[PDB]
Design a protein around this ligand. Structure first.
Ligand code: ZN
Ligand code: ZN
Length: 519
């Protein structure tokens, strides 16, 4: 029988069992080597076991076309077209960079026909004012994600075919697939709608916003690069310096977390040369003069974590990360509202930090470790090196820890999210699911909003249901960047001007914040 091995796929490659491209940045499928068969880890279980072996409209799986097109360089048609490699797969368009002929297995753009606003058509000269006249009949335009409530509103991508005849082929072939998909009546698995909240006229300070957190439906706080922390009462349309104006003069607020049970705001403050942590009672949200409390000996910090799901709802901890150590601080009811609890030496430089369920979690390059904070000292790796299927992590030099998720619905299971993969382990540190979450493109940011992992890249946010280990949505946005720790409040460019968007969970019966209606 086959001798499968986890393989880094170097070029866009169809699964031998289902024909879908093996997307991802690392370990994208299994490869046999005895017979050269390549396939998804999840597909291997149904491949014939005899080794040299002799778009699906329902389930929505399969590669349909693999071709070359031209597409504008980053910046527009005025600067010229460049040859790219397009794959139509799983009712999606995969755009790849290429060089005439070396194609890497990194997608630069995904266009999902499951998008409510997917359309493809030709263009008039007014839609592409800069294309050469003789080129207009060769160009087609694909539309996807609409930004609701916007003040244009839709993500558009232009492709130029080699002939007008090939252009019409492209338009017709993508339309028939969209129509096939619509008729297939596949369940809607999308996670988010995108809603514009503020633009540069309603929030001119948007260009220097660095972070934000939700207080409740009616108000958020936003940290700015030079003006501190402000509380926005959205419906009242009011901008209130947290702790008063004196506290927010020439103050650089880089991150902000809100602890609702304890009524505390916790911040990484400062220009790089005096980065440190400050916390303040959220009574300060109303603009009263109230001095932000300095957390002593947090200079040079690079991460801050406030604990969630504290056991029994106790006040709990926050932790500050340094280059080779972490300090844990206990929240309390004294004047300072906190106290140093414990210094922890770290095996390497923390790359991610979190506290939840009474445990501290720190990620490094190729591991995560946890320290129990209840019953206290006791360090536990989340990867048991007696699991032969996990030993590959020690042999990695390029991995970076991003975040860890306790899987919703699987309390004894964790998703370890690296720059390259998402890996599932149980509480013993052994592998708990054979397939690994793949990301189509190199991520610029990761955020998590239960149960959705949100992976931000240049042209889209890709959404993963952590419970199902399923890629459920592609949200095309231009240079999206999360503002809140959980990403659902983000910024992005709309007609090259910055806007503030909410990623609204379509399963809720009300928006996460009150959205002002844009008319
Ligand atoms: Zn084989
Ligand atoms: Zn497959």
């Amino acid at each position: 029988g086959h001798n499968f091995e986890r393989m880094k796929i170097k070029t866009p490659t169809k699964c031998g069992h289902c024909t879908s491209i093996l997307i991802g940045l690392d370990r994208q499928g299994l490869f046999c080597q005895s017979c050269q068969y390549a396939c998804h880890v999840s597909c291997a279980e149904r491949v014939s076991q005899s080794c040299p072996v002799p778009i699906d409209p329902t389930r929505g799986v399969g590669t349909a076309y693999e071709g070359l097109v031209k597409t504008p360089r980053a910046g527009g048609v005025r600067k010229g077209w460049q040859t790219a490699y397009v794959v139509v797969c799983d009712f999606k368009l995969y755009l790849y960079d290429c060089t005439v002929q070396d194609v890497k297995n990194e997608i630069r753009l995904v266009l999902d026909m499951r998008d409510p606003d997917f359309t493809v058509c030709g263009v008039s000269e007014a839609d592409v004012i800069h294309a050469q006249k003789g080129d207009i009949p060769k160009i087609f335009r694909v539309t996807t994600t609409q930004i609701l409530n916007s003040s244009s509103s839709k993500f558009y991508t232009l492709f130029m075919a080699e002939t007008e005849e090939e252009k019409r082929k492209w338009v017709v072939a993508l339309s028939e697939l969209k129509t096939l998909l619509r008729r297939s009546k596949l369940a809607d698995r999308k996670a988010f709608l995108v809603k514009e909240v503020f633009d540069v006229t309603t929030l001119p300070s948007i260009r220097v916003a660095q972070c934000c957190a939700i207080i409740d439906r009616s108000k958020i706080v936003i940290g700015f690069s030079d003006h501190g922390l402000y509380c926005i009462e959205i419906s009242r349309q009011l901008l209130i310096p947290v702790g008063g104006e004196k506290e927010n003069k020439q103050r650089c607020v880089e991150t902000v977390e809100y602890d609702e049970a304890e009524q505390l705001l916790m911040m990484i403050v400062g220009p790089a040369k005096d980065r440190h942590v400050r916390i303040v009672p959220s009574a300060a949200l109303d603009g009263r003069d109230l001095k932000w409390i300095k957390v002593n000996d947090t200079k040079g910090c690079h991460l801050l974590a406030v604990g969630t799901n504290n056991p029994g709802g106790r006040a709990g901890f926050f932790a500050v990360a340094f280059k080779k150590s972490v300090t844990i601080f206990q929240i309390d009811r004294s004047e300072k509202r906190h106290k140093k609890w414990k210094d922890l030496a770290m095996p390497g430089t923390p790359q991610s930090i979190a506290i939840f369920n009474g445990r501290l979690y720190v990620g490094f390059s190729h591991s995560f470790r946890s320290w129990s904070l209840v019953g206290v000292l006791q360090h536990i790796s989340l990867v048991n090196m007696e699991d032969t299927s996990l030993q590959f992590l020690n042999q990695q030099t390029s991995y970076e820890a991003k975040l860890i998720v306790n899987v919703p619905g699987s309390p004894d299971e964790y998703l370890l999210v690296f720059n390259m993969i998402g890996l599932y382990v149980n509480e013993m540190g052994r592998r708990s699911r054979l397939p690994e979450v793949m990301f189509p493109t190199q991520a610029k940011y990761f955020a998590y909003h239960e149960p959705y992992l949100c992976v931000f890249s240049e042209n889209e946010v890709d959404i993963f249901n952590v419970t199902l280990a399923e890629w459920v949505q592609t949200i095309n946005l231009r240079s999206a960047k999360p503002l809140s720790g959980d990403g659902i409040l983000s910024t992005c460019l709309c007609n090259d001007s910055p806007i503030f968007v909410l990623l609204q969970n379509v399963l809720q019966d009300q928006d996460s914040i009150e959205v002002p209606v844009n008319l």
